[PDB]
Design an enzyme around this catalytic site. Structure first.
Site, PDB file in Angstrom:
ATOM      1  N   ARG D  16       0.849  -1.188   0.000  1.00  0.00           N
ATOM      2  CA  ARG D  16       0.000   0.000   0.000  1.00  0.00           C
ATOM      3  C   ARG D  16       0.885   1.239   0.000  1.00  0.00           C
ATOM      4  O   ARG D  16       2.109   1.151   0.106  1.00  0.00           O
ATOM      5  CB  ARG D  16      -0.953   0.005   1.203  1.00  0.00           C
ATOM      6  CG  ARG D  16      -0.237   0.293   2.535  1.00  0.00           C
ATOM      7  CD  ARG D  16      -1.205   0.378   3.733  1.00  0.00           C
ATOM      8  NE  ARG D  16      -0.662   1.205   4.818  1.00  0.00           N
ATOM      9  CZ  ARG D  16      -1.251   1.370   6.000  1.00  0.00           C
ATOM     10  NH1 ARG D  16      -2.391   0.757   6.260  1.00  0.00           N
ATOM     11  NH2 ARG D  16      -0.700   2.145   6.931  1.00  0.00           N
ATOM     12  N   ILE D  18       3.148   4.470  -0.468  1.00  0.00           N
ATOM     13  CA  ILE D  18       4.288   4.746  -1.347  1.00  0.00           C
ATOM     14  C   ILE D  18       4.773   3.465  -2.017  1.00  0.00           C
ATOM     15  O   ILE D  18       5.018   3.436  -3.230  1.00  0.00           O
ATOM     16  CB  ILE D  18       5.421   5.441  -0.564  1.00  0.00           C
ATOM     17  CG1 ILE D  18       5.015   6.869  -0.209  1.00  0.00           C
ATOM     18  CG2 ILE D  18       6.718   5.448  -1.386  1.00  0.00           C
ATOM     19  CD1 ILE D  18       5.995   7.592   0.732  1.00  0.00           C
ATOM     20  N   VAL D  60      10.418  -7.807   6.983  1.00  0.00           N
ATOM     21  CA  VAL D  60      11.838  -7.504   6.795  1.00  0.00           C
ATOM     22  C   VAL D  60      12.625  -7.498   8.098  1.00  0.00           C
ATOM     23  O   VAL D  60      13.858  -7.547   8.057  1.00  0.00           O
ATOM     24  CB  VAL D  60      12.075  -6.156   6.068  1.00  0.00           C
ATOM     25  CG1 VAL D  60      11.422  -6.166   4.692  1.00  0.00           C
ATOM     26  CG2 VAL D  60      11.622  -4.958   6.922  1.00  0.00           C
ATOM     27  N   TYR D 151      12.011   8.317  14.969  1.00  0.00           N
ATOM     28  CA  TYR D 151      11.799   8.237  13.529  1.00  0.00           C
ATOM     29  C   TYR D 151      12.855   9.031  12.772  1.00  0.00           C
ATOM     30  O   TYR D 151      13.481   8.514  11.842  1.00  0.00           O
ATOM     31  CB  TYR D 151      10.396   8.727  13.176  1.00  0.00           C
ATOM     32  CG  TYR D 151      10.103   8.695  11.685  1.00  0.00           C
ATOM     33  CD1 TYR D 151       9.663   7.526  11.070  1.00  0.00           C
ATOM     34  CD2 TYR D 151      10.272   9.831  10.896  1.00  0.00           C
ATOM     35  CE1 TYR D 151       9.385   7.493   9.700  1.00  0.00           C
ATOM     36  CE2 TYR D 151      10.004   9.804   9.533  1.00  0.00           C
ATOM     37  CZ  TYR D 151       9.560   8.633   8.942  1.00  0.00           C
ATOM     38  OH  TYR D 151       9.291   8.618   7.592  1.00  0.00           O
ATOM     39  N   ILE D 184       3.596  12.782   1.637  1.00  0.00           N
ATOM     40  CA  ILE D 184       2.937  12.039   0.572  1.00  0.00           C
ATOM     41  C   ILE D 184       1.626  11.511   1.138  1.00  0.00           C
ATOM     42  O   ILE D 184       1.611  10.941   2.234  1.00  0.00           O
ATOM     43  CB  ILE D 184       3.823  10.885   0.062  1.00  0.00           C
ATOM     44  CG1 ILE D 184       5.244  11.379  -0.227  1.00  0.00           C
ATOM     45  CG2 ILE D 184       3.175  10.211  -1.171  1.00  0.00           C
ATOM     46  CD1 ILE D 184       5.315  12.523  -1.231  1.00  0.00           C
ATOM     47  N   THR D 186      -0.907   9.064   1.881  1.00  0.00           N
ATOM     48  CA  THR D 186      -0.888   7.599   1.969  1.00  0.00           C
ATOM     49  C   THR D 186      -1.810   7.150   3.091  1.00  0.00           C
ATOM     50  O   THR D 186      -2.304   7.995   3.856  1.00  0.00           O
ATOM     51  CB  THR D 186       0.520   7.060   2.256  1.00  0.00           C
ATOM     52  OG1 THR D 186       0.937   7.496   3.560  1.00  0.00           O
ATOM     53  CG2 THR D 186       1.521   7.500   1.201  1.00  0.00           C
ATOM     54  N   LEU D 188      -0.845   5.692   5.765  1.00  0.00           N
ATOM     55  CA  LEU D 188      -0.174   6.043   7.009  1.00  0.00           C
ATOM     56  C   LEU D 188      -0.450   7.498   7.372  1.00  0.00           C
ATOM     57  O   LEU D 188      -0.791   7.803   8.517  1.00  0.00           O
ATOM     58  CB  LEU D 188       1.327   5.777   6.904  1.00  0.00           C
ATOM     59  CG  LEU D 188       2.220   6.180   8.095  1.00  0.00           C
ATOM     60  CD1 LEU D 188       1.844   5.451   9.391  1.00  0.00           C
ATOM     61  CD2 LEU D 188       3.694   5.936   7.757  1.00  0.00           C
TER      62      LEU D 188
HETATM   63  N1  LIG Z   1       3.891   9.245   3.760  1.00  0.00           N
HETATM   64  C1  LIG Z   1       4.817  10.198   3.925  1.00  0.00           C
HETATM   65  O1  LIG Z   1       4.534  11.419   3.921  1.00  0.00           O
HETATM   66  C2  LIG Z   1       6.261   9.776   4.098  1.00  0.00           C
HETATM   67  C3  LIG Z   1       7.213  10.786   4.202  1.00  0.00           C
HETATM   68  C4  LIG Z   1       8.556  10.469   4.271  1.00  0.00           C
HETATM   69  C5  LIG Z   1       8.940   9.153   4.255  1.00  0.00           C
HETATM   70  N2  LIG Z   1       8.007   8.183   4.176  1.00  0.00           N
HETATM   71  C6  LIG Z   1       8.493   6.712   4.176  1.00  0.00           C
HETATM   72  O2  LIG Z   1       7.929   6.052   3.075  1.00  0.00           O
HETATM   73  C7  LIG Z   1       7.802   4.644   3.384  1.00  0.00           C
HETATM   74  C8  LIG Z   1       6.389   4.183   3.105  1.00  0.00           C
HETATM   75  O3  LIG Z   1       5.462   4.942   3.909  1.00  0.00           O
HETATM   76  P1  LIG Z   1       3.888   5.020   3.601  1.00  0.00           P
HETATM   77  O4  LIG Z   1       3.403   6.396   3.857  1.00  0.00           O
HETATM   78  O5  LIG Z   1       3.609   4.394   2.292  1.00  0.00           O
HETATM   79  O6  LIG Z   1       3.347   4.064   4.762  1.00  0.00           O
HETATM   80  P2  LIG Z   1       2.223   2.938   4.808  1.00  0.00           P
HETATM   81  O7  LIG Z   1       1.899   2.613   6.219  1.00  0.00           O
HETATM   82  O8  LIG Z   1       0.982   3.523   4.062  1.00  0.00           O
HETATM   83  O9  LIG Z   1       2.784   1.667   4.006  1.00  0.00           O
HETATM   84  C9  LIG Z   1       3.942   0.951   4.484  1.00  0.00           C
HETATM   85  C10 LIG Z   1       3.845  -0.482   4.023  1.00  0.00           C
HETATM   86  O10 LIG Z   1       4.968  -1.232   4.544  1.00  0.00           O
HETATM   87  C11 LIG Z   1       4.488  -2.399   5.178  1.00  0.00           C
HETATM   88  N3  LIG Z   1       5.407  -2.800   6.239  1.00  0.00           N
HETATM   89  C12 LIG Z   1       5.492  -2.277   7.504  1.00  0.00           C
HETATM   90  N4  LIG Z   1       6.292  -2.941   8.305  1.00  0.00           N
HETATM   91  C13 LIG Z   1       6.774  -3.971   7.510  1.00  0.00           C
HETATM   92  C14 LIG Z   1       7.636  -5.053   7.775  1.00  0.00           C
HETATM   93  N5  LIG Z   1       8.187  -5.293   8.972  1.00  0.00           N
HETATM   94  N6  LIG Z   1       7.899  -5.910   6.761  1.00  0.00           N
HETATM   95  C15 LIG Z   1       7.332  -5.692   5.569  1.00  0.00           C
HETATM   96  N7  LIG Z   1       6.504  -4.708   5.202  1.00  0.00           N
HETATM   97  C16 LIG Z   1       6.252  -3.884   6.226  1.00  0.00           C
HETATM   98  C17 LIG Z   1       3.087  -2.050   5.670  1.00  0.00           C
HETATM   99  O11 LIG Z   1       2.362  -3.249   5.910  1.00  0.00           O
HETATM  100  C18 LIG Z   1       2.578  -1.218   4.487  1.00  0.00           C
HETATM  101  O12 LIG Z   1       2.040  -2.022   3.437  1.00  0.00           O
HETATM  102  C19 LIG Z   1       8.280   4.482   4.837  1.00  0.00           C
HETATM  103  O13 LIG Z   1       9.646   4.063   4.881  1.00  0.00           O
HETATM  104  C20 LIG Z   1       8.103   5.895   5.402  1.00  0.00           C
HETATM  105  O14 LIG Z   1       8.958   6.183   6.502  1.00  0.00           O
HETATM  106  C21 LIG Z   1       6.692   8.462   4.101  1.00  0.00           C
END
Ligand SMILES: NC(=O)c1ccc[n+]([C@@H]2O[C@H](COP(=O)([O-])OP(=O)(O)OC[C@H]3O[C@@H](n4cnc5c(N)ncnc54)[C@H](O)[C@@H]3O)[C@@H](O)[C@H]2O)c1
Ligand SMILES: NC(=O)c1ccc[n+]([C@@H]2O[C@H](COP(=O)([O-])OP(=O)(O)OC[C@H]3O[C@@H](n4cnc5c(N)ncnc54)[C@H](O)[C@@H]3O)[C@@H](O)[C@H]2O)c1
Ligand SMILES: NC(=O)c1ccc[n+]([C@@H]2O[C@H](COP(=O)([O-])OP(=O)(O)OC[C@H]3O[C@@H](n4cnc5c(N)ncnc54)[C@H](O)[C@@H]3O)[C@@H](O)[C@H]2O)c1
Ligand SMILES: NC(=O)c1ccc[n+]([C@@H]2O[C@H](COP(=O)([O-])OP(=O)(O)OC[C@H]3O[C@@H](n4cnc5c(N)ncnc54)[C@H](O)[C@@H]3O)[C@@H](O)[C@H]2O)c1
Ligand SMILES: C[C@]12CC[C@@H]3c4ccc(O)cc4CC[C@H]3[C@@H]1CCC2=O
Ligand SMILES: C[C@]12CC[C@@H]3c4ccc(O)cc4CC[C@H]3[C@@H]1CCC2=O
Ligand SMILES: C[C@]12CC[C@@H]3c4ccc(O)cc4CC[C@H]3[C@@H]1CCC2=O
Ligand SMILES: C[C@]12CC[C@@H]3c4ccc(O)cc4CC[C@H]3[C@@H]1CCC2=O
Ligand code: NA
Ligand code: NA
Ligand code: NA
Ligand code: NA
Lengths: 257, 257, 257, 257
Positions: D16, D18, D60, D151, D184, D186, D188
């Site tokens: 889901r 990003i 992971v 974080y 972004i 999402t 989350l």
């Molecule tokens: N959304 C933002 O604004 C934002 C900003 C900066 C960085 N990020 C980074 O982008 C990445 C994705 O974030 P997102 O907003 O899509 O979050 P999200 O919660 O919407 O999606 C994250 C996905 O990773 C999976 N996941 C979590 N723990 C896991 C594990 N142990 N093993 C395997 N899969 C696992 C979840 O089940 C989920 O499908 C992250 O590394 C986050 O720190 C997000």
């Protein structure tokens, strides 16, 4: 090519080197490209070679050249979507005491005010198209370089200007980004090495300055430009490093006394 | 010394190297200093040498050690104005495939969570004194280094953590800053060079990695720490580079193919 | 004061604001200080006020002014240890289309080429003294700012130039560093706010732009300059942020469409 | 799609947000994609939806999960060209005194050591293919954020680790880069906003944190990843900001007293 189809791009200094690599990349993406250059030789041949590229003689330090460049682009193609400010010069190495204020001003005219002037004249059209600006700066603007005080200063200004303009133009949907190349193998690089006592040694040192062990290609700067224009829709005010990792880690730059 | 008179400072890893240079600098400024270290040899001697420095045995990876360090500091001196998180380790060079997750975790315990834990226990007292936190990070956190993936990652975390904490503590007047040293001539540097096939060559390379042509001294990191504590009252969340210019310009890090 | 005793310092734009704070800091450290300014009012009064500061009328954009400034400094005090290039101007806010190339060039003359020219004329004497150069740049050179394309570009150039010059002068032991202030409460800040529809609101916004909740003081930039001159002996080519954390974290700068 | 045809890509957390945007982008480019996720719901549906994507359940933080992920990828598709380390978590906001060392360690397990472990197991295959590594870090690793000390620290580590690994792997032709997204939109982001007293206000503030006036889309992070994998052949150790300009200029982060 499809990723920038129907778009019109102006590339300054596009007759050779990095600029010609950017021209080819945008043509390959489906854009129409206006090659702007102060010298006819390379740009004229590029127009003949590439369907969808045309050459317009234009010295970016001459404001009337630049006005004609923009008005001719609009007259001939009906829109303007992207301006790539690549025109620039790296003087032969100079110790600081060998530089002059007037040489500094002249380098500012090309590397900085030329970019400013075309950008200014193009922005009304870029606003209409939700287009974007790509400035070609230099890694040495960020990390410095020896025997290049004026050059480094002009590139520091371009990178900073890119962020200021990104802020001003964000309400209009116009993105403004820059690329900072490191060592890219171009005719300018080759000419500069030729002035050195051992050109081959200088070229060898240039290759080993980056962890990838080679210099970059104009096509690789071109791919980065097409990405910024066509696909980086949430990127503005960024500095995209195209350097092969030259800025990473320790190197030879010269026990606690 | 007058510039930090009446203030109480805790320096972790203060028994030798950079930490001992920071201890001496703060004593020279008029502060009382608690030398925290896991090893007795250097820190005990430093307490005997410096009026106004005392040594408390404390392994920063042991939470009960750190709690006792803070409570003993308050019991003995009545306030706490500055915490310098210097304790840390640079493992011998390791290719990535030679590293382990468990070695990575252990290095995180010392370089990162030790800094986090003392900071957390000290902040209630730092808030009462409008004190400040100084983390000793590393230039390689910012620019990377070869054969040091875990070390580089822990320092990237310390520098980032410094900015996050500066944001959290700014409403309370507590500044949080870091120093990023480059090559500083210390017992750790000398031990690491000794493992190399040609230690003198390795030391020679370390000196020439910066444009100043020498490594730094612990006293120079110490002067930077005293500045941040006593005079940088509008600085928070900054990374103060003490590197001799190692990050500037091109070097040897390894024609367009 | 003892930390820079026996040293001779030139501060441009030292008649008021940040420059006057730097003058006072260096006098307080035991240096003799030459106050350089294009306006007589503030600098003349400062000479009368401070034993060990003298005022020399000098417009840094006039090369003959600057030559006389250096030769008079040497004639009167016998050495030159530190040059602080503080003279500079922030024009009232301007949208990009409201800027001109000629206004851009004029701002480059003051903020960039004035710094270049004094530095060049001073370096022979700085080499003899193993002195150092401190450029006052701006945080907005690094992060950009709205309605200030020329100003931001000149400061990007100063910060970059600082690193290039640090590289060139490192073999001679001459350090070259810059300070990047954020919002410092000065007469320039107050004048600029006065042009705004609600000056008090503009000042209130300026205070809350940093996590510390206030603007900085000229004395705090002055303390940072004295540190760089007198104690940062392993620092060269660094950009010392004096910003109260303005660059940290998210703020208001303007769901995925 | 043609730009990454014949290539095999692993995206962690691809079920889901990003990660799913990156999966779709690589499928659209002609790659075969292994969706790795700890939760079945989203990733299973994505495998059914996209020809050329398959789902492998993998946490992971569990080394045996990751080993099986790599061996299954090789068994089923015969090569591995790109690993995208996207799996990660942003805990709800926490003041520093509300954090714990053990919560910090757990977040390090997911955001940092999970990325380290898959990268390590994949590099032998990436070396054979001259493949590349793309780490998804965060803008807040570079600039900090309030109420997110653990974080921010994990992302500072990821960005730094990316440069260290780029240095180690450059002799083998394996590029290692990271993307630093800002806000972004999402699941989350939406969940985190829902915990707030006024979710809509929090979402509104998140949009206005960048000069573009909106949050980014997963597809825009996906386009940046495909660029790094397929076209950034002279980019290694870079941090590609996908932030809408959030890091530019002054904002509200909180007269000289
Ligand atoms: N959304 C933002 O604004 C934002 C900003 C900066 C960085 N990020 C980074 O982008 C990445 C994705 O974030 P997102 O907003 O899509 O979050 P999200 O919660 O919407 O999606 C994250 C996905 O990773 C999976 N996941 C979590 N723990 C896991 C594990 N142990 N093993 C395997 N899969 C696992 C979840 O089940 C989920 O499908 C992250 O590394 C986050 O720190 C997000
Ligand atoms: N080659 C490198 O390693 C390198 C590194 C960093 C940055 N750069 C930058 O990349 C850009 C291109 O450099 P290059 O290596 O391709 O150089 P180049 O000399 O090979 O090509 C530059 C082109 O610009 C043209 N040009 C010069 N002045 C002009 C003017 N006034 N008006 C119009 N066109 C003009 C030249 O005629 C030429 O065709 C420059 O801005 C340079 O500073 C290059
Ligand atoms: N020397 C350099 O060139 C250099 C460069 C960049 C950063 N640094 C950093 O500077 C700091 C000091 O390094 P140094 O060169 O002085 O090293 P060092 O080995 O000479 O001294 C470190 C001191 O910390 C102590 N220490 C180690 N683990 C500890 C623990 N668990 N609890 C308490 N004390 C502990 C050691 O006993 C020693 O007295 C470290 O954080 C290091 O990463 C050093
Ligand atoms: N105030 C801030 O928030 C701020 C922020 C970032 C950077 N800065 C920089 O700090 C420096 C000082 O700014 P300030 O706020 O004290 O401004 P200011 O206007 O209060 O003082 C500047 C001084 O320089 C003098 N000066 C101007 N032009 C000169 C010339 N040609 N020759 C000689 N002297 C000249 C002026 O007469 C004045 O005395 C500038 O370089 C400015 O860009 C200021
Ligand atoms: C120079 C060659 C030419 C390089 C060059 C060429 C073009 C350019 O736009 C920037 C640069 C920066 C580095 C320059 C080298 C430093 C040492 C050397 O030999
Ligand atoms: C290492 C010596 C030890 C250095 C060192 C020592 C201590 C430290 O905290 C950090 C570093 C980073 C660079 C390290 C060198 C790289 C090459 C070499 O020989
Ligand atoms: C400006 C006031 C004056 C500030 C200022 C003043 C002096 C200076 O050298 C730099 C700056 C940069 C930010 C400027 C503000 C942005 C919004 C505003 O109201
Ligand atoms: C948080 C929402 C969630 C954001 C978020 C979400 C996911 C992520 O990986 C990083 C971040 C960083 C900023 C976070 C916001 C700060 C203020 C707020 O309300
Ligand atoms: Na053509
Ligand atoms: Na003692
Ligand atoms: Na006087
Ligand atoms: Na499928």
């Amino acid at each position: 090519g499809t990723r920038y189809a129907g778009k019109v791009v102006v590339v300054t200094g596009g007759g050779r080197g990095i600029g010609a690599g950017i021209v080819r990349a945008f043509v390959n993406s489906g854009a129409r490209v206006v090659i702007c250059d102060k010298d006819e030789s390379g740009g004229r041949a590029l127009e003949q070679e590439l369907p969808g590229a045309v050459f317009i003689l234009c010295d970016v330090t001459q404001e009337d050249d630049v006005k004609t460049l923009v008005s001719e682009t609009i007259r001939r193609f009906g829109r303007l979507d992207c301006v790539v400010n690549n025109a620039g010069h790296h003087p032969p190495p100079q110790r600081p005491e060998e530089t002059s204020a007037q040489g500094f001003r002249q380098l500012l005219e090309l590397n900085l005010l030329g970019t400013y002037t075309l950008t200014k004249l193009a922005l009304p059209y870029l606003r209409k198209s939700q287009g974007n600006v790509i400035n070609i700066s230099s890694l040495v603007g960020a990390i410095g370089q020896a025997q290049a005080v004026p050059y480094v200063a002009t590139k520091g200004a371009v990178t900073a200007m890119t962020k200021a303009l990104a802020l001003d133009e964000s309400p209009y949907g116009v993105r403004v980004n820059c690329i900072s190349p490191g060592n890219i193998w171009t005719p300018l690089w080759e000419e500069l090495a030729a002035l050195m006592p051992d050109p081959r040694a200088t070229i060898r040192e240039g290759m080993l300055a980056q962890p990838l062990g080679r210099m970059g290609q104009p096509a690789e700067v071109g791919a980065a430009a097409v990405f910024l224009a066509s696909e980086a829709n949430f990127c503005t005010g960024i500095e995209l490093l195209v350097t092969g990792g030259a800025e990473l880690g320790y190197g030879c730059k010269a026990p606690s006394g």
